[model samples]
Target: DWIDSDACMICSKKFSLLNRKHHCRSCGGVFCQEHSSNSIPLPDLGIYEPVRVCDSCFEDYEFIVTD
Candidate 1:
């Protein structure tokens, strides 16, 4: 089975984190966007709803935070 790491502070994946960025503070992973997620910069503080998606899971599954 796939391992679920902590919230990718950057990509926002409840599970499946395989990289580390600048110490994994943001989208942390073992490799990088090329290995797991992509590069989607986050906001100062995720919207009230927060964006629901992984770096690489973009295209059809994009979540827009609402008030």
Candidate 2:
């Protein structure tokens, strides 16, 4: 039901305190601090305010990526 690996899904970086782990509310995958710093509005999940999510899931929420 949760992520078993300890690597960031996007950059594949190892998890540590400086790169703390965070869960994507949409996909339920684990991401590091750098790769999971975007907040998006999730109306489907009843999350009106911006919620923290990973890079990929963050894009799915329609938040434009400047990069």
Candidate 3:
């Protein structure tokens, strides 16, 4: 409770204490309007992020599958 909820760096959208989620495995940072590549609104994420990355950051990760 000491730290404030972190908001999306790209957009001004803020995450609530209950909605606090890690950046998507495909997107390194929170997807906001400015940096959003997702076509639809997102729901809560309840799992470990395999790899923190964003769609814009995905190009560099294509060859990293089996490594």
Candidate 4:
């Protein structure tokens, strides 16, 4: 679900040098570097290597692994 929005999908922060955009492998939503700092393996999505993900997706994946 790749998106081309102007602002971060989660924090709504505008993109700039200070807040660069990052694509979440889990959901494909664009986010700021601060909000998309978590990197994890997404084997289910065919992402064997660790990739960046937004905080929300990070939490969901964490919960899935723990539970």
Model number with the top lDDT = 4
Error of 4 at 59 (Å): 0.8
Candidates 1 and 4 compared: the better one by TM-score is 4
Q: TM-scores of the models, in the given order?
A: 0.23, 0.74, 0.33, 0.87
Best of the two (3, 4) by TM-score: 4
Q: What is the per-residue lDDT of model 3 for residues 1-67, given as tens digits with 9 covering 90 to 100?
A: 1122378664557776654444644344575444444332222345434444445655444445346
Cα misplacement distance, residue 27 of candidate 3 (Å): 9.0
Indicate the residue-level lDDT of 59 in model 1: 34
Q: lDDT tens digits, residues 1-67, model 1?
A: 1334445445554434344432222333322343334333345445334333344333322444321
- Score residue 30 of candidate 3 by CA lDDT: 71
What ranges in model 1 sit over 4 Å off? 1-25, 45-67
Question: Stretches of candidate 2 above 4 Å error?
Answer: 1-4, 63-67
Off by over 4 Å in 3: 1-5, 17-19, 24-49, 63-67
lDDT for every model?
A: 0.38, 0.78, 0.47, 0.89
Give the Å error, residue 47, model 3.
16
* Model 2 error, position 10 (Å): 1.5
Scored against the true structure, residue 5 in model 3 reaches a CA lDDT of 30
Lowest-sum lDDT 10-residue window in model 1: 22-31
Error of 4 at 17 (Å): 2.1
Candidate 1 is scored at a TM of 0.23
> Which residue pairs collide, candidate 2?
none
- Cα deviation of 37, candidate 1, in Å: 6.4
Rank candidates, TM-score, best first: 4, 2, 3, 1
Model 4, residue 37: what's the lDDT?
90
**Residues 1-67 of candidate 4: C-alpha lDDT, one tens digit per residue:** 7877889987798998877878988898999988899899999888888899999989999999999
